[PDB]
Amino acid sequence: VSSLQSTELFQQQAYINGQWLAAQSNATVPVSNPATGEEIGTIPNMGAAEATQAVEAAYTALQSWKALTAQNRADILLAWHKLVLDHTDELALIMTIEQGKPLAEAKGEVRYAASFIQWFAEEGKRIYGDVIPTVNNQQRFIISKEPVGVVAAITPWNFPIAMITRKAAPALAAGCTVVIKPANETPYCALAIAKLAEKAGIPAGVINVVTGKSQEIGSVFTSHEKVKKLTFTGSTPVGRLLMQQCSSTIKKLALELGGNAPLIVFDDADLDKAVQGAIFAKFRNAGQTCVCANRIYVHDNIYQAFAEKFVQEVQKFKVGNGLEDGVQIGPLINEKAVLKAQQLIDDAVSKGAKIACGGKQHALGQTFYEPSVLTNVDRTMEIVQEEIFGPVAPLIRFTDEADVVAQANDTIFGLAAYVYSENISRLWRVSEQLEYGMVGMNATAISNEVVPFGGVKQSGVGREGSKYGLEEFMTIKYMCLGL
Amino acid sequence: SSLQSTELFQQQAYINGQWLAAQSNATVPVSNPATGEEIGTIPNMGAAEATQAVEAAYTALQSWKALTAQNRADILLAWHKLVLDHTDELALIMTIEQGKPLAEAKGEVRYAASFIQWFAEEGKRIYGDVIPTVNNQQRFIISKEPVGVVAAITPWNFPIAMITRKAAPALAAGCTVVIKPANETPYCALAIAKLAEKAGIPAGVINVVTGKSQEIGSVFTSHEKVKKLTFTGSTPVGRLLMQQCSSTIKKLALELGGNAPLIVFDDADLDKAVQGAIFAKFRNAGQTCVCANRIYVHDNIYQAFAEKFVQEVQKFKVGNGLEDGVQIGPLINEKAVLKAQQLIDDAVSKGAKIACGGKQHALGQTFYEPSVLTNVDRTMEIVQEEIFGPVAPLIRFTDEADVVAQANDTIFGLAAYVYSENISRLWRVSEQLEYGMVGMNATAISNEVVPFGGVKQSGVGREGSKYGLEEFMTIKYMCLGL
Amino acid sequence: VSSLQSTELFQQQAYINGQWLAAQSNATVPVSNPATGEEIGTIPNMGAAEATQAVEAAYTALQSWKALTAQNRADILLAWHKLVLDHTDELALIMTIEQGKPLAEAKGEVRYAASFIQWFAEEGKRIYGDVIPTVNNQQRFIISKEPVGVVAAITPWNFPIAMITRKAAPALAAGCTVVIKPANETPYCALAIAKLAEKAGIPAGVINVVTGKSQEIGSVFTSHEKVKKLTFTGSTPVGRLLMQQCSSTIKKLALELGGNAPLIVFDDADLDKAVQGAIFAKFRNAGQTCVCANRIYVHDNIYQAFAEKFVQEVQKFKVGNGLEDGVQIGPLINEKAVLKAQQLIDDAVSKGAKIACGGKQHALGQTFYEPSVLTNVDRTMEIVQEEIFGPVAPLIRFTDEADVVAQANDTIFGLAAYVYSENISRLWRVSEQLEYGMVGMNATAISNEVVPFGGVKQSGVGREGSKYGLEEFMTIKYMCLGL
Amino acid sequence: VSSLQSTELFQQQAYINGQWLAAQSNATVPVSNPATGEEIGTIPNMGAAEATQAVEAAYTALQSWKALTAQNRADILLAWHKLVLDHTDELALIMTIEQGKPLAEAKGEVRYAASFIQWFAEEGKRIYGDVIPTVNNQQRFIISKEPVGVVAAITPWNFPIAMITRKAAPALAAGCTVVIKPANETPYCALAIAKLAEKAGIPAGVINVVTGKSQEIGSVFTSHEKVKKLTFTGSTPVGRLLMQQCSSTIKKLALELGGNAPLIVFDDADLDKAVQGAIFAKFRNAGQTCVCANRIYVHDNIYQAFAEKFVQEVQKFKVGNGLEDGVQIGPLINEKAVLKAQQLIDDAVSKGAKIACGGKQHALGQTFYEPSVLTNVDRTMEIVQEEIFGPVAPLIRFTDEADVVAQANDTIFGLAAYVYSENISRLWRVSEQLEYGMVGMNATAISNEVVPFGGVKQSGVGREGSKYGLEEFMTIKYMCLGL
């Protein structure tokens, strides 16, 4: 687009050791706008050779980056933070064009992403060691924290800026250097963040972005001896594989994988509050989010009222290009996601589910899918066991509390959940019984930089943001001082 | 008869509060490494029994984690008391099946008991957080919850401490545990389970499955209900177990190999370094993950250090662990003797001298002579491989940056030791050593209050200390909307 | 009372430097059973001289007591803990006879008191210091914790055992030594605990109990150069004085003073739960507790129903000697308390308050007072501005939320408060607005050893029990290591 | 002077509730340049009436200041931080003229003072509560932290900017409001900081500066019911009085009082390192610091060598006006300090001490004192028991380790101490035996914003800066939630 070429942050080259490079073979692959299908540019189709160069550059830069004081790195990171916020409109324009979400959501993500840079710039000055009461009066126990080393980050496409800073910021603040493999569907967001890193004074090699062959690059990131940690956000099948490859060198892991988030609305809940909350938890980013409400359980006594209000809100949605005014629902990332959504809806309907609205591709074509609502859904339908990653809201009837809790936990995942109830005992009892890493209690806007973000079970390991985020990128050194 | 007279000697496995044989009635013999005699047998269980233990642990998990932290602390402390009260009986079992001297066995029992007491107290202190809100309509309340069923696979070098170091923090966290101990030293694990039964630990909360390692380990690392694996052993096995745990994204705790370096600079307290290097090298006959594998000594004190060192080694009394004053027991098996002889032969063929020892001991069996090698350098295999034996390779060096590079020239990073009376050098070198634990003018670094673990391919996670219990917990972020 | 002479723990001499001593003047003051009026024994009437001997002994014992390891002190403190529980019946007997509370409550306090010994024996091993990320690469910042030194503890009569352990246990666990001045009304509990310390192997001088002249003993405790901290629990006027005397040497302070605890019952509260909870908060220890509900605010829409059910429960109480079976309300500590209770009720009645039940001395005479309930109370009555410290429940009517919150905070105190409401927003809103250090939310049984016990404003400073209790007795040492 | 009339930060009026006011009586007191004696200007001589207005203004502004989010206050405080640094040269100019220290030191203090604003702006976002494991499965223990309320700060003259931020920054970041009474010798530094607070958008009443009658203003700060915490830095006798006045209302206390800092140089020390460190510890701010080396103990085996080198460095000092190039020693704050310094030198000389250099007023007159060095000092001299607060270095001979430690601790104070030794055992043994809150170990530049600054014994209570500085301005609230 001409609107892309007018920004200094639109880069069609990779970023390795402070240089803007093409692949050694000069090959390139195209990037497309999911709302129009047109090609917006190309990126280098790099592979193992270039990925190794990045690791080597990150390792060399590691020695002098960790030697700086915490305040040295904090000042640089804050300059990075300032640049990200000053270029909010331009970063959002890139995101909407290559990823498809509305411009308002893209700007929100930019601010959400920038807050992690500021947060961890401050954490770096506060990663405290310990002094442990000795069991032997001739020894003193002094515990310190040190960076793991070179970090490998593999990021997805649904949040093409926040998933970068959520991994790069804590890594850098910890004294680590990072090599990044971004999704080929949304690479320009990562490269734009790297361009601002250059302007912020982040030395060469501390942050590297390698685009192209995912398997070849990922293979090097998960095997190279100098990569000490792998942080990955994406599907669970890919997570199983990456962790498998990391086994040969015992690499530290940080995984944020799939999520089948249940949203439970009891009959004693604030009905209007639960509806607006469920609307937000379901249709944000067109439902293409790991913490999106994949199952909405509603009690029998309010099922009819809830469904009617819920459908009324869904029918107000404006679907179209993310650059249009007032647009709320963008297109799905690719055709496979459309096919997955149509299958799960067809399966549900074949088992008695009704379509309250939507249920087919949108008139705009491309990968646009109609915002949909299903009623009469039960546990025998595949849409209860699989992630939709689309704007499809299955409303599941229930009555007994012990039964809905069992259904909510009847999944390999355990990322985010949501409970709506004005009864204090029920609210706490259910939140504690839910086997999830995050539980919204009469709230669904749970995302921010100060709370520990992550899941349990097969939703992954580790936490991003919060006081717990920085320790993920550090190791413990126990000094036994003999006096 | 010495162990038949012990109520703690058990030749059956422990699953869901029952003393079971294998479904096939198959058993495997256990031998005394100092004499060669067969002590008894243990069930040779497989995948079926391993699955029964996982199921039993999951059923017991619901009511075990429902108790209060103080309820569990009381039960754990009764377990702690019984362990210390049966120190002599436990040490007798360990020495007979493992080989180490009776004095070392008693020390491990107390060391091991301290973990039960430590984590009984930690269970009452798994603090959550209240985080300052970014939105005045919400409150951020963070809590900690048990991961669930834990699978523990333990080695033979510390057959009791490696059990409590994993089972104690798991139980204190509200978890239940299934344990696969080493077939060379199973009776120590079964004796600890018999005490657990006497301490009132409910059925299924702790289970010990003996026999086929590959079959039992395959179930532990794949069964959907097992949420965490904690393993201590060789790195190649750790790689395999981590790989198998990948299909269900299991949480990991790994304590693997360790090629521990010990550096003695010329400004060190010479006598203090010698006594420290002796302790770090010859404890448990050198069969320890944190044992001094490489002993770097500066050129200006190399000769003096080697002389004093050899003098101490030649005082060692080698023999049966039950004899008075015995300090060096036998190696665990014949493979260890062959490895040690191969590594010494390679070093000698490249210029190394044998200051003492260097061959099997006159007592036969798996006894190996306490040995000291001089003129060792980095081209020898003994510097790149773990000996797990009473062999001390003394390596000469001069430059500080060079010995630091040699110390880090390894895939491991468990324990390291530095001796120097210069404050700035002691801190500079310790901070440059890529290890999870660094002894600074000290080598007796083991205890229950310090975080025990390594970096790089020496593994992940920590045992003991304030950090040991969070390994068995998950974080729950509650966003309360007002 | 020969039941006292038959226990090894009944001691009529003070405890200083491991010896059982009388006053240098051989002067004694009698102790009485408040339920019967009999003399049960005497205690030494010591003054400044003996108090100075205890401080000197504590300072000498401090050198070797703080040199031990945390595990060494833990073993000794746990032996002390074991002995306290093993002698629960004997300690409860002594308390009931000299203090008056029922034998069941006394046994509860002994177990409550014992838990502090166990808790802080464990805390002593965990007074972690810090390693702070340096701002100058040539220095390292290592923070450690050290005992403050000799501690002075002045305790009241309402909880004559728990108040001792709540101060002596953390002091000893921190590496400190303690000199104790217990209330002359209930000294045998303090001396009994000291006799068990001797049996537990606590070295001589580590714990000392000085009985007699409060002004003379307290003057030494608050001025001797070697006393580095004062921990006091009692009346606010005395607290002001002790703190003032502590000024000349800048002594560290721990004060738990008065508390005009309010208990608010909104109309959306579980009525039955609030009644039982308010009954417990008011009549425990016959109302003679710092956290007892002094003001019971009840909303207009449930005032009549709450009052009726509350009075029904109060009329079931059995009043009498604490040793009898099923006794729930004992006698007040002394005649002054009966006077003050009667005066406050008379003032309230003269301004429109009605006596629903009680309102005069009990038929048993002595210092027994009838469990009473007042209705139609308002803020103009003195019973709302003064602690009654007795079994009298003033039920105050309110309607507006902002007003009842203003009334609850309209006091110089800020120790404990209680709020009953099934509305989540109201419960948090009010609890956060109440200027108190402790707020029970749909609960009144708030006392235990793991939670931080203390107040704000003129209710005092510092906390007892919990992770925060041991730091009170430690100082910080910042080591700046230059490399 | 006209150089002050040319900066917008030179204010000759007080700052109360966002207004620039004169005293109700219009009375004024003069401020003088100690280097020239000239009158620089006047400040309002306010009293109790105006101090009460400030408290009322701080209490009113408190309600809305604490209702903001931690990030809200962080943004405002960081704007304040940016302004302080942007106006470094102007702030340093004011300090050098009214306080006397060299312009280079003043600029250093500005940066030092600014770092506390940044540090606590970040701490405000990290004042974490707790969730304690329950002892009763029907309750949940949620611990939160709340601001103590209006804070009263009384600051000295030796660091007329850093002492302001070291108290106002954590107070504001905690959600508190502050009223400040600065030293009449250096008021313009405090008012200039207030002018920058106004520009930074800090609302009216959140920060107030009352100048004039110290006792009258201090009496209101230490007695008004709404002042909940006093933080004071100054002389121990004044601290004793302020604490005594705070007793009537049980106000929370933070005190940083006197400090008879010993510096011990053993014979196994890096001689040159110990000399340069002793020079820095002694003559920074012309020796007018609470942590300045008041006693310099030097082992007998290196006493002659240490002295010769020490006097060599002292004789290189350039004494003169703080605005002149290369000046390193400025004038003392007033004439009383010159007299006290001469008295302590006379007493030492009368008991055998030798003057190696200096020992009298400087040729420049005014309050300039010659940088002096005394040898042959011993414990019987007054200079060893009294703070000299001047450029006078008493070198004290010693031999035995146990003796020099006993001499170091033979004081009521316990603020800062320094030890130089290349023996690891001795360095740790001695540092652990020194009853001080801060110990430099082969280092004397111990001051920075991330380390806990404070003393033990009669040197005061509490800590400033570091992870421990913010809790001093918070209270703990224990919520016992009943399910």
Residue numbers in the entry:
A (entry chain A), C (entry chain B), D (entry chain D): 1 to 483
B (entry chain C): 2 to 483
Sentences copied from the publication:
Acinetobacter baumannii is an opportunistic human pathogen which can use host-derived L-carnitine as sole carbon and energy source. Furthermore, genes cntA and cntB of the operon encode for a two-component carnitine monooxygenase which facilitates the initial C-N bond cleavage of L-carnitine which results in the formation of trimethylamine (TMA) and malic semialdehyde (MSA). Using recombinantly purified enzymes, enantiomer-specific formation of D-malate by the NAD(P)+-dependent malic semialdehyde dehydrogenase (MSA-DH) is demonstrated. Based on these findings, it was concluded that A. baumannii MSA-DH catalyzes the stereospecific formation of D-malate which might be further metabolized as part of the degradation pathway.
The asymmetric unit contains an overall of three individual MSA-DH homotetramers which is consistent with our gel filtration and mass photometry experiments. The biological unit is composed of two obligate dimers (e.g., AB and CD colored brown/blue and green/pink) which are arranged to generate a tetramer with almost perfect D2 symmetry. The L-shaped monomer consists of the N-terminal Rossmann dinucleotide-binding domain (green, residues 1–126 and 150–261), the α/β catalytic domain (blue, residues 262–441), and the oligomerization domain (brown, residues 127–149 and 441–483). Every monomer possesses two funel-like invaginations which were proposed as potential entry sites for the MSA substrate and the cofactor NAD(P)+, respectively. Starting from opposite sides, both channels meet in a region where the two highly conserved amino acids Cys290 and Glu256 are localised. The respective amino acid of MSA-DH was identified as Asn184. Accordingly, a relaxed NAD(P)+ cofactor specificity was expected on the basis of the solved MSA-DH structure. The obtained active site model was further substantiated as amino acid residues Arg166, Arg284 and Ser447 were located at an appropriate distance for hydrogen bonding interaction with the carboxylate group of the substrate. The solved crystal structure places the active site loop in a conformation which closely resembles the reduced `active state` of human succinic semialdehyde dehydrogenase.
